[PDB]
């Protein structure tokens, strides 16, 4: 008796698979991918937007915006001082 | 992915042979019954012969 048609009925190996549910994943996911990001933000040279260049890196964990932005503090109040006195 | 992919390419085009084959196969054995039928009444013969 003729063979039966099972291995040429593909169209359930299609889903068949955990790995298809991930290529439909990464056909959207890798395709709409950029070589390199949109942009980081780090300036706009908004003038404080170079603060932010300067101190707010995404690599400048270094004390001196924090040190700079507490003596801001210090030159405000001190004037109130003798805004006081 | 591509992997699993790959069997079934070659799957596809190869199976079409093996299903061709075994209908040409069994085509081979219904001339067969023709042939049984000439070799039985060989036999047969034989036998009422022989029996005289």
Same mark, same amino acid.
């Given at each position: 008796?003729?063979?039966?048609?099972?291995?040429?009925?593909?169209?359930?190996?299609?889903?068949?698979?955990?790995?298809?549910?991930?290529?439909?994943?990464?056909?959207?996911?890798?395709?709409?991918?950029?070589?390199?990001?949109?942009?980081?933000?780090?300036?706009?040279?908004?003038? +404080?937007?170079?603060?932010?260049?300067?101190?707010?890196?995404?690599?400048?964990?270094?004390?001196?915006? +924090?040190?700079?932005?507490? +003596? %801001?503090?210090?030159?405000? %109040?001190?004037?109130?001082?003798?805004?006081?006195? | 992915?591509?992997?699993?992919?790959?069997?079934?390419?070659?799957?596809?085009?190869?199976?079409?042979?093996?299903?061709?084959?075994?209908?040409?196969?069994?085509?081979?054995?219904?001339?067969?019954?023709?042939?049984?039928?000439?070799?039985?009444?060989?036999?047969?013969?034989?036998?009422?012969?022989?029996?005289?």
């Amino acid at each position: 008796v003729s063979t039966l048609i099972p291995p040429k009925v593909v169209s359930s190996k299609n889903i068949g698979s955990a790995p298809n549910a991930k290529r439909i994943a990464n056909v959207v996911h890798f395709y709409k991918s950029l070589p390199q990001g949109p942009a980081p933000a780090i300036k706009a040279n908004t003038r +404080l937007a170079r603060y932010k260049a300067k101190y707010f890196d995404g690599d400048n964990a270094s004390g001196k915006p +924090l040190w700079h932005f507490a +003596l %801001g503090i210090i030159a405000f %109040g001190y004037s109130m001082e003798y805004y006081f006195h | 992915r591509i992997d699993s992919v790959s069997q079934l390419q070659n799957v596809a085009e190869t199976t079409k042979v093996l299903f061709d084959v075994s209908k040409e196969t069994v085509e081979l054995e219904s001339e067969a019954f023709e042939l049984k039928q000439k070799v039985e009444l060989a036999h047969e013969a034989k036998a009422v012969l022989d029996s005289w």
